[PDB]
């Protein structure tokens, strides 16, 4: 288990004297110190942890308990020290929610203008300076940066800088070049702000609002997540308001655990975040839908989870459905002990903690902070209304060939002109040469005379792997500019859930070599297929999605790799079951010839699992895995028997 | 051979520094001639300030200018204003030909209740010459040297000194006798009486710092205030 | 009442500014006269640097390195050409003509451009601007003509050739698109912006003013470093 994470407070040997610093790059550690920032890599053990940036909506495990239970961070309280700027008078402890920014607006701060809600993407700000001789001027920060910002600051600058400023008041000075002004900064203001206007409560207003109309802009400060960070430059409010800078921080947050216990005031040093949560782990409040092969044909039936025993891998979910008439919901049931593997994130209706949501056509905004037991999303705020509402109206913000190519298989609707047809056929002949020479085991392919570009491929699971036995079928087309660009691959799903982090049910497969996560003209279909059977079905299908190698050798990596191996087993069983029922016309006989032994071998292996160094991480079997695998195995046996292929 | 050539160029720079000393003397000469040219203009300023040519004049012109400038505001105490508003004029005479490079910041005072002097002439002296010790130190008309003036105070009004008191009980009689001592009082007019410099140069750090302050103040009053007094009176001058 | 007198003396200050402009014109006349007077000394400097009479390697390159303002301008490709700087002199504008000082950087021509003698003519504030006479603290630089360099092709340190592979949109034809991008160099000094550009012009004026008052009259002080980087 690594101990440091992103944005944690660390104390280290910067210049002999221990200096605090925030860590930025986290091995996928790098620290920047408080007084003078020198971003640098430091040994994790050597660095001393002081605070954690456990921000809301963050998934975290307790750092001392033997239970690896995960939970969601609802609210956070930061007790922070503050120093008056330019002085070492440090006030401590103070709470973050009392400090304020300097500028009235900042990148992203929600704004509501003339019945239009938007994010300030880019804005131009001023500095109003008071001069030694009593002159107040407005200097655009483009020049203000030249002065050697916050209320009360004292700068000095050559008079030339004040050539383009606007002298609001006082004796306009003589801009001599042989001496410099000394200026105080009374205020920092906003000149004009650019907005995106993503949505609203007919046409959007202009992308930029200037001072002439900026008075219409009212800031939605209710949606503040600008939780104090070490070195953040704020306005202290006395218990008179002054300018301060944070010195040290202590984050204590409320974490809703999977078992459903809401534990409050947890020092963040006993909690550490989860970078890579398995897709199936449902924390309480998720909106999820049953996904079993046969159960629940109705799509209007949805579910909200209430607790999941982490070790058990079984989540209890309440099943709701929408009433056909009226903005009401109908309670289906309270089924408990449901395999997470049989549950899937609802395509819509995602409401994490403290998200900003809009009402679908009164209150128009809010912070979704809790998910009700009745599946009603908590928050639609006009001003701290706290009114429960349903998701119904919320928006969250060896080689072979064939004479014809079957219509529904391979690729169609392609009519690109190759640079030279004969050259393209010559490249294709080179490819047949390579394929015939190679592919002694494991892989195989065929193509079609009517469209030499069109190809079909069949790939087999390797041994001692969650994708053991099994079967996989790919359509492919060689671009008419081949080998100028990588070939067009597509893995027919025959399933619904991602059988692999890279294989997509939609069928736009990707791999590292093909450049989509490089490709070259010298590359050949043989290399790509060898990689597909070498990596896309690697021993541990975890990793291979997005630099997840960083978790290699870690406790989290091991646990989530085991879980993903289990889900891969479930969905490969599902994929074979569906493949048997609707084998493509391209390969009808070849599915059966292999399955006649492979399917029963896999079923026997699954049965053995229900009751030894076998090469891939799956032990122990969780209760939910037992249930889901038993169901899918029964379905697979039924399919195999229906296919005229009894026990073998 | 290279460093001998640099030394030859060094001697050439020494001779060029002597030539530049001549050039600065000529610059002072041109300043004197253009001071004669100003005499109309500066005299007109002094005349309109003190109601000689057209509330009379410009009340507290020089006290106001000194207050607006930090370098002089820091010096004018609350008890110095009653004296320093009586400054009829400040003006910079320059040394005639042949006399040492110098300029006199003469302070014309109206008949006052504090001292009977008509004018206080805090003469300064430049060095047009590169001294043999460090000729290259001649970055220009440097101001090292000064000559104040002695001001006799009318009874009961002096501000440069103040009386401190102590009391001790007599052992025999038991009377609590009192003793008094005159001690320096923070006053702008102590500007006029700089600490006399010992010949050997044994100047305490206080003397060096106060002399540097006096010298920069004199140079400032020469080049900034008196030539461009108005830019500073109305606040248009930046004054750091 | 008093404000009227302040305004009258303000007019008098404008008049004093005019007379000070004449004073600085005559100071420039004294500068011409003393340039003639320097002519023996500065010519001996020039000969010694060029070893004409009983040079100093990289004299002006060195003096450019020892000063923060000038060393910041010399890049890695500036040194090969800038060490060929083998004399500097500030010609002072002839009488009657507008106040100007013509920085003469003779740049003994060798292998990079064909200019026998090069210049960076500048413009002084001869007289106060009528908009605000008080701003006339003296001869302030208010422009930099710059010369027209006759570069020898292949050593144009002001530009760099950068190429990248690209494809025509729609057509898809591959092309190695090449472009000449302005490159930072001290010789961009000599072709300044034609009157961010304002900041470059201000820094350029400061560099020229420094090079006139301090670098040239006190070149030796800077090669040895005895002087301070004012």
PDB file of C-alpha atoms in Angstrom, chain A residues 256-475:
ATOM      1  CA  UNK A 256     -20.875   7.055   3.968  1.00  0.00           C
ATOM      2  CA  UNK A 257     -19.574   3.499   4.031  1.00  0.00           C
ATOM      3  CA  UNK A 258     -20.880   0.675   1.866  1.00  0.00           C
ATOM      4  CA  UNK A 259     -22.552  -1.003   4.839  1.00  0.00           C
ATOM      5  CA  UNK A 260     -24.530   2.226   5.093  1.00  0.00           C
ATOM      6  CA  UNK A 261     -23.059   3.637   8.304  1.00  0.00           C
ATOM      7  CA  UNK A 262     -22.673   7.424   8.148  1.00  0.00           C
ATOM      8  CA  UNK A 263     -19.577   8.112  10.248  1.00  0.00           C
ATOM      9  CA  UNK A 264     -18.935  11.807  10.867  1.00  0.00           C
ATOM     10  CA  UNK A 265     -15.794  13.726  11.829  1.00  0.00           C
ATOM     11  CA  UNK A 266     -13.200  11.326  10.430  1.00  0.00           C
ATOM     12  CA  UNK A 267      -9.696  12.735  10.302  1.00  0.00           C
ATOM     13  CA  UNK A 268      -8.546  12.261   6.728  1.00  0.00           C
ATOM     14  CA  UNK A 269      -5.274  10.705   7.876  1.00  0.00           C
ATOM     15  CA  UNK A 270      -7.319   7.605   8.781  1.00  0.00           C
ATOM     16  CA  UNK A 271      -8.963   7.637   5.326  1.00  0.00           C
ATOM     17  CA  UNK A 272      -7.259   7.219   1.983  1.00  0.00           C
ATOM     18  CA  UNK A 273      -8.809   7.627  -1.469  1.00  0.00           C
ATOM     19  CA  UNK A 274      -9.410   5.014  -4.139  1.00  0.00           C
ATOM     20  CA  UNK A 275      -7.926   5.854  -7.527  1.00  0.00           C
ATOM     21  CA  UNK A 276      -9.224   2.812  -9.417  1.00  0.00           C
ATOM     22  CA  UNK A 277     -12.596   1.543  -8.213  1.00  0.00           C
ATOM     23  CA  UNK A 278     -13.927  -1.578  -9.905  1.00  0.00           C
ATOM     24  CA  UNK A 279     -16.837  -0.669 -12.152  1.00  0.00           C
ATOM     25  CA  UNK A 280     -19.192  -2.998 -10.269  1.00  0.00           C
ATOM     26  CA  UNK A 281     -18.638  -1.631  -6.748  1.00  0.00           C
ATOM     27  CA  UNK A 282     -21.894   0.169  -5.968  1.00  0.00           C
ATOM     28  CA  UNK A 283     -21.849   2.509  -3.080  1.00  0.00           C
ATOM     29  CA  UNK A 284     -25.176   3.337  -1.409  1.00  0.00           C
ATOM     30  CA  UNK A 285     -27.280   5.702  -3.498  1.00  0.00           C
ATOM     31  CA  UNK A 286     -26.264   4.497  -6.960  1.00  0.00           C
ATOM     32  CA  UNK A 287     -29.051   4.122  -9.519  1.00  0.00           C
ATOM     33  CA  UNK A 288     -28.630   0.649 -10.990  1.00  0.00           C
ATOM     34  CA  UNK A 289     -30.543  -1.734 -13.246  1.00  0.00           C
ATOM     35  CA  UNK A 290     -30.809  -5.511 -13.286  1.00  0.00           C
ATOM     36  CA  UNK A 291     -28.809  -7.076 -16.098  1.00  0.00           C
ATOM     37  CA  UNK A 292     -29.488 -10.811 -15.888  1.00  0.00           C
ATOM     38  CA  UNK A 293     -29.886 -12.796 -19.096  1.00  0.00           C
ATOM     39  CA  UNK A 294     -33.574 -13.544 -18.534  1.00  0.00           C
ATOM     40  CA  UNK A 295     -34.899 -11.689 -15.492  1.00  0.00           C
ATOM     41  CA  UNK A 296     -36.559  -8.276 -15.716  1.00  0.00           C
ATOM     42  CA  UNK A 297     -37.403  -7.735 -19.404  1.00  0.00           C
ATOM     43  CA  UNK A 298     -39.064  -4.444 -18.475  1.00  0.00           C
ATOM     44  CA  UNK A 299     -36.663  -1.502 -19.007  1.00  0.00           C
ATOM     45  CA  UNK A 300     -38.706   0.871 -16.814  1.00  0.00           C
ATOM     46  CA  UNK A 301     -37.657  -1.183 -13.768  1.00  0.00           C
ATOM     47  CA  UNK A 302     -34.636   0.422 -12.107  1.00  0.00           C
ATOM     48  CA  UNK A 303     -32.920   0.024  -8.757  1.00  0.00           C
ATOM     49  CA  UNK A 304     -31.161   2.034  -6.073  1.00  0.00           C
ATOM     50  CA  UNK A 305     -28.599   0.301  -3.869  1.00  0.00           C
ATOM     51  CA  UNK A 306     -28.589   0.561  -0.072  1.00  0.00           C
ATOM     52  CA  UNK A 307     -25.704  -1.576   1.167  1.00  0.00           C
ATOM     53  CA  UNK A 308     -23.044  -3.912  -0.127  1.00  0.00           C
ATOM     54  CA  UNK A 309     -21.014  -6.247   2.056  1.00  0.00           C
ATOM     55  CA  UNK A 310     -17.628  -5.665   0.438  1.00  0.00           C
ATOM     56  CA  UNK A 311     -16.328  -9.139   1.245  1.00  0.00           C
ATOM     57  CA  UNK A 312     -19.642 -10.663   0.189  1.00  0.00           C
ATOM     58  CA  UNK A 313     -19.765  -8.906  -3.195  1.00  0.00           C
ATOM     59  CA  UNK A 314     -23.557  -8.964  -2.747  1.00  0.00           C
ATOM     60  CA  UNK A 315     -25.431  -5.657  -2.806  1.00  0.00           C
ATOM     61  CA  UNK A 316     -28.963  -5.090  -1.561  1.00  0.00           C
ATOM     62  CA  UNK A 317     -30.946  -2.921  -3.978  1.00  0.00           C
ATOM     63  CA  UNK A 318     -34.493  -1.581  -3.843  1.00  0.00           C
ATOM     64  CA  UNK A 319     -36.367  -2.013  -7.119  1.00  0.00           C
ATOM     65  CA  UNK A 320     -38.547   0.923  -8.192  1.00  0.00           C
ATOM     66  CA  UNK A 321     -40.403   1.776 -11.371  1.00  0.00           C
ATOM     67  CA  UNK A 322     -42.152   4.880 -12.643  1.00  0.00           C
ATOM     68  CA  UNK A 323     -45.926   5.040 -12.502  1.00  0.00           C
ATOM     69  CA  UNK A 324     -47.391   5.188 -16.034  1.00  0.00           C
ATOM     70  CA  UNK A 325     -49.258   8.380 -15.089  1.00  0.00           C
ATOM     71  CA  UNK A 326     -48.368  11.216 -12.748  1.00  0.00           C
ATOM     72  CA  UNK A 327     -44.927  12.228 -11.466  1.00  0.00           C
ATOM     73  CA  UNK A 328     -44.886   9.319  -9.020  1.00  0.00           C
ATOM     74  CA  UNK A 329     -42.875   6.135  -8.531  1.00  0.00           C
ATOM     75  CA  UNK A 330     -44.002   2.575  -7.818  1.00  0.00           C
ATOM     76  CA  UNK A 331     -42.031   0.416  -5.387  1.00  0.00           C
ATOM     77  CA  UNK A 332     -41.346  -2.996  -6.898  1.00  0.00           C
ATOM     78  CA  UNK A 333     -39.512  -4.565  -3.996  1.00  0.00           C
ATOM     79  CA  UNK A 334     -36.667  -4.673  -1.505  1.00  0.00           C
ATOM     80  CA  UNK A 335     -34.642  -7.586  -2.855  1.00  0.00           C
ATOM     81  CA  UNK A 336     -31.410  -8.123  -0.918  1.00  0.00           C
ATOM     82  CA  UNK A 337     -28.327 -10.278  -1.455  1.00  0.00           C
ATOM     83  CA  UNK A 338     -28.064  -9.416  -5.157  1.00  0.00           C
ATOM     84  CA  UNK A 339     -24.843 -10.035  -7.055  1.00  0.00           C
ATOM     85  CA  UNK A 340     -23.236  -6.784  -8.133  1.00  0.00           C
ATOM     86  CA  UNK A 341     -22.213  -8.706 -11.251  1.00  0.00           C
ATOM     87  CA  UNK A 342     -25.923  -8.939 -12.119  1.00  0.00           C
ATOM     88  CA  UNK A 343     -26.337  -5.180 -11.555  1.00  0.00           C
ATOM     89  CA  UNK A 344     -25.236  -2.371 -13.870  1.00  0.00           C
ATOM     90  CA  UNK A 345     -24.997   1.396 -13.553  1.00  0.00           C
ATOM     91  CA  UNK A 346     -28.185   2.968 -14.833  1.00  0.00           C
ATOM     92  CA  UNK A 347     -27.478   4.613 -18.217  1.00  0.00           C
ATOM     93  CA  UNK A 348     -29.147   7.789 -16.949  1.00  0.00           C
ATOM     94  CA  UNK A 349     -29.923   8.957 -13.414  1.00  0.00           C
ATOM     95  CA  UNK A 350     -26.396   9.304 -12.010  1.00  0.00           C
ATOM     96  CA  UNK A 351     -26.448  11.479  -8.866  1.00  0.00           C
ATOM     97  CA  UNK A 352     -23.280  11.465  -6.785  1.00  0.00           C
ATOM     98  CA  UNK A 353     -22.774  13.634  -3.725  1.00  0.00           C
ATOM     99  CA  UNK A 354     -22.728  17.432  -4.130  1.00  0.00           C
ATOM    100  CA  UNK A 355     -23.244  17.501  -7.888  1.00  0.00           C
ATOM    101  CA  UNK A 356     -24.972  20.515  -9.417  1.00  0.00           C
ATOM    102  CA  UNK A 357     -28.194  19.538 -11.177  1.00  0.00           C
ATOM    103  CA  UNK A 358     -30.834  21.324 -13.252  1.00  0.00           C
ATOM    104  CA  UNK A 359     -34.574  20.728 -13.146  1.00  0.00           C
ATOM    105  CA  UNK A 360     -36.186  19.356 -16.292  1.00  0.00           C
ATOM    106  CA  UNK A 361     -39.364  21.212 -17.217  1.00  0.00           C
ATOM    107  CA  UNK A 362     -39.569  27.405  -9.133  1.00  0.00           C
ATOM    108  CA  UNK A 363     -36.190  26.017  -8.038  1.00  0.00           C
ATOM    109  CA  UNK A 364     -33.790  25.456 -10.935  1.00  0.00           C
ATOM    110  CA  UNK A 365     -30.455  24.466  -9.342  1.00  0.00           C
ATOM    111  CA  UNK A 366     -29.079  22.585  -6.356  1.00  0.00           C
ATOM    112  CA  UNK A 367     -26.412  20.349  -4.863  1.00  0.00           C
ATOM    113  CA  UNK A 368     -27.364  16.658  -4.883  1.00  0.00           C
ATOM    114  CA  UNK A 369     -25.938  15.611  -1.513  1.00  0.00           C
ATOM    115  CA  UNK A 370     -27.768  12.419  -0.507  1.00  0.00           C
ATOM    116  CA  UNK A 371     -29.732   9.698  -2.282  1.00  0.00           C
ATOM    117  CA  UNK A 372     -32.990   8.854  -0.554  1.00  0.00           C
ATOM    118  CA  UNK A 373     -34.057   5.395   0.523  1.00  0.00           C
ATOM    119  CA  UNK A 374     -37.077   5.928  -1.745  1.00  0.00           C
ATOM    120  CA  UNK A 375     -34.701   6.536  -4.712  1.00  0.00           C
ATOM    121  CA  UNK A 376     -35.603  10.241  -4.743  1.00  0.00           C
ATOM    122  CA  UNK A 377     -32.654  12.531  -5.369  1.00  0.00           C
ATOM    123  CA  UNK A 378     -32.440  14.933  -2.449  1.00  0.00           C
ATOM    124  CA  UNK A 379     -31.677  18.398  -3.692  1.00  0.00           C
ATOM    125  CA  UNK A 380     -33.335  21.001  -5.880  1.00  0.00           C
ATOM    126  CA  UNK A 381     -32.430  24.286  -4.191  1.00  0.00           C
ATOM    127  CA  UNK A 382     -33.883  27.719  -4.717  1.00  0.00           C
ATOM    128  CA  UNK A 383     -32.411  28.806  -1.382  1.00  0.00           C
ATOM    129  CA  UNK A 384     -31.623  25.847   0.897  1.00  0.00           C
ATOM    130  CA  UNK A 385     -34.997  24.267   0.132  1.00  0.00           C
ATOM    131  CA  UNK A 386     -34.015  20.620   0.780  1.00  0.00           C
ATOM    132  CA  UNK A 387     -36.859  19.110  -1.258  1.00  0.00           C
ATOM    133  CA  UNK A 388     -36.753  15.473  -2.388  1.00  0.00           C
ATOM    134  CA  UNK A 389     -37.374  14.875  -6.102  1.00  0.00           C
ATOM    135  CA  UNK A 390     -37.251  11.844  -8.395  1.00  0.00           C
ATOM    136  CA  UNK A 391     -34.724  11.379 -11.234  1.00  0.00           C
ATOM    137  CA  UNK A 392     -37.590  11.748 -13.712  1.00  0.00           C
ATOM    138  CA  UNK A 393     -36.784  15.441 -14.230  1.00  0.00           C
ATOM    139  CA  UNK A 394     -33.150  16.029 -13.209  1.00  0.00           C
ATOM    140  CA  UNK A 395     -30.148  16.692 -15.444  1.00  0.00           C
ATOM    141  CA  UNK A 396     -26.664  16.211 -13.978  1.00  0.00           C
ATOM    142  CA  UNK A 397     -23.753  18.479 -14.865  1.00  0.00           C
ATOM    143  CA  UNK A 398      -5.156 -21.543 -41.376  1.00  0.00           C
ATOM    144  CA  UNK A 399      -6.077 -19.054 -44.078  1.00  0.00           C
ATOM    145  CA  UNK A 400      -9.236 -19.530 -46.124  1.00  0.00           C
ATOM    146  CA  UNK A 401     -11.594 -17.646 -48.438  1.00  0.00           C
ATOM    147  CA  UNK A 402     -15.248 -17.639 -49.453  1.00  0.00           C
ATOM    148  CA  UNK A 403     -16.888 -16.614 -52.705  1.00  0.00           C
ATOM    149  CA  UNK A 404     -19.398 -14.224 -51.070  1.00  0.00           C
ATOM    150  CA  UNK A 405     -19.265 -12.063 -47.950  1.00  0.00           C
ATOM    151  CA  UNK A 406     -22.404 -12.384 -45.780  1.00  0.00           C
ATOM    152  CA  UNK A 407     -24.354  -9.140 -45.713  1.00  0.00           C
ATOM    153  CA  UNK A 408     -24.656  -8.838 -41.927  1.00  0.00           C
ATOM    154  CA  UNK A 409     -20.988  -9.703 -41.281  1.00  0.00           C
ATOM    155  CA  UNK A 410     -17.564  -8.228 -42.048  1.00  0.00           C
ATOM    156  CA  UNK A 411     -17.834  -4.553 -43.122  1.00  0.00           C
ATOM    157  CA  UNK A 412     -20.014  -2.874 -45.745  1.00  0.00           C
ATOM    158  CA  UNK A 413     -20.844   0.633 -46.986  1.00  0.00           C
ATOM    159  CA  UNK A 414     -17.165   1.242 -47.841  1.00  0.00           C
ATOM    160  CA  UNK A 415     -16.281   2.498 -51.325  1.00  0.00           C
ATOM    161  CA  UNK A 416     -12.990   4.353 -50.858  1.00  0.00           C
ATOM    162  CA  UNK A 417     -10.685   4.579 -53.862  1.00  0.00           C
ATOM    163  CA  UNK A 418      -7.293   2.929 -53.226  1.00  0.00           C
ATOM    164  CA  UNK A 419      -4.225   4.799 -54.511  1.00  0.00           C
ATOM    165  CA  UNK A 420      -3.691   1.915 -56.941  1.00  0.00           C
ATOM    166  CA  UNK A 421      -6.075  -1.040 -57.001  1.00  0.00           C
ATOM    167  CA  UNK A 422      -3.438  -3.497 -58.214  1.00  0.00           C
ATOM    168  CA  UNK A 423      -1.019  -2.317 -55.524  1.00  0.00           C
ATOM    169  CA  UNK A 424      -3.731  -2.843 -52.907  1.00  0.00           C
ATOM    170  CA  UNK A 425      -4.295  -6.388 -54.163  1.00  0.00           C
ATOM    171  CA  UNK A 426      -0.527  -6.952 -54.071  1.00  0.00           C
ATOM    172  CA  UNK A 427      -0.440  -5.891 -50.424  1.00  0.00           C
ATOM    173  CA  UNK A 428      -3.406  -8.179 -49.769  1.00  0.00           C
ATOM    174  CA  UNK A 429      -1.503 -11.060 -51.397  1.00  0.00           C
ATOM    175  CA  UNK A 430       1.477 -10.317 -49.161  1.00  0.00           C
ATOM    176  CA  UNK A 431      -0.950 -10.546 -46.250  1.00  0.00           C
ATOM    177  CA  UNK A 432      -2.284 -13.934 -47.355  1.00  0.00           C
ATOM    178  CA  UNK A 433       1.306 -15.113 -47.679  1.00  0.00           C
ATOM    179  CA  UNK A 434       2.048 -14.057 -44.108  1.00  0.00           C
ATOM    180  CA  UNK A 435      -1.182 -15.541 -42.744  1.00  0.00           C
ATOM    181  CA  UNK A 436      -0.732 -18.889 -44.488  1.00  0.00           C
ATOM    182  CA  UNK A 437       2.880 -19.072 -43.327  1.00  0.00           C
ATOM    183  CA  UNK A 438       1.888 -18.226 -39.747  1.00  0.00           C
ATOM    184  CA  UNK A 439      -1.100 -19.115 -37.538  1.00  0.00           C
ATOM    185  CA  UNK A 440      -0.181 -22.701 -36.568  1.00  0.00           C
ATOM    186  CA  UNK A 441      -2.305 -22.581 -33.412  1.00  0.00           C
ATOM    187  CA  UNK A 442      -4.692 -20.418 -31.457  1.00  0.00           C
ATOM    188  CA  UNK A 443      -5.571 -17.904 -34.178  1.00  0.00           C
ATOM    189  CA  UNK A 444      -7.356 -18.319 -37.440  1.00  0.00           C
ATOM    190  CA  UNK A 445      -8.902 -16.213 -40.196  1.00  0.00           C
ATOM    191  CA  UNK A 446     -10.760 -16.317 -43.496  1.00  0.00           C
ATOM    192  CA  UNK A 447     -11.834 -13.803 -46.124  1.00  0.00           C
ATOM    193  CA  UNK A 448     -14.101 -13.389 -49.141  1.00  0.00           C
ATOM    194  CA  UNK A 449     -13.383 -13.170 -52.860  1.00  0.00           C
ATOM    195  CA  UNK A 450     -16.160 -10.650 -53.537  1.00  0.00           C
ATOM    196  CA  UNK A 451     -14.420  -8.160 -51.205  1.00  0.00           C
ATOM    197  CA  UNK A 452     -10.777  -8.986 -50.521  1.00  0.00           C
ATOM    198  CA  UNK A 453     -10.668  -6.152 -47.981  1.00  0.00           C
ATOM    199  CA  UNK A 454     -13.347  -7.880 -45.903  1.00  0.00           C
ATOM    200  CA  UNK A 455     -11.978 -10.436 -43.440  1.00  0.00           C
ATOM    201  CA  UNK A 456     -13.219 -12.436 -40.460  1.00  0.00           C
ATOM    202  CA  UNK A 457     -11.051 -13.716 -37.624  1.00  0.00           C
ATOM    203  CA  UNK A 458     -11.491 -16.167 -34.765  1.00  0.00           C
ATOM    204  CA  UNK A 459      -9.481 -15.968 -31.551  1.00  0.00           C
ATOM    205  CA  UNK A 460      -9.300 -18.479 -28.711  1.00  0.00           C
ATOM    206  CA  UNK A 461      -8.815 -17.970 -25.001  1.00  0.00           C
ATOM    207  CA  UNK A 462      -5.405 -18.901 -23.578  1.00  0.00           C
ATOM    208  CA  UNK A 463      -4.839 -21.353 -20.748  1.00  0.00           C
ATOM    209  CA  UNK A 464      -4.692 -20.548 -17.026  1.00  0.00           C
ATOM    210  CA  UNK A 465      -6.566 -17.338 -17.849  1.00  0.00           C
ATOM    211  CA  UNK A 466     -10.040 -16.018 -17.002  1.00  0.00           C
ATOM    212  CA  UNK A 467     -10.515 -16.043 -20.774  1.00  0.00           C
ATOM    213  CA  UNK A 468      -9.710 -19.747 -20.944  1.00  0.00           C
ATOM    214  CA  UNK A 469     -11.404 -21.769 -23.658  1.00  0.00           C
ATOM    215  CA  UNK A 470     -14.198 -19.431 -24.746  1.00  0.00           C
ATOM    216  CA  UNK A 471     -14.395 -18.009 -28.241  1.00  0.00           C
ATOM    217  CA  UNK A 472     -14.093 -14.631 -29.956  1.00  0.00           C
ATOM    218  CA  UNK A 473     -15.138 -13.459 -33.423  1.00  0.00           C
ATOM    219  CA  UNK A 474     -13.938 -10.328 -35.232  1.00  0.00           C
ATOM    220  CA  UNK A 475     -14.935  -8.558 -38.426  1.00  0.00           C
TER     221      UNK A 475
END
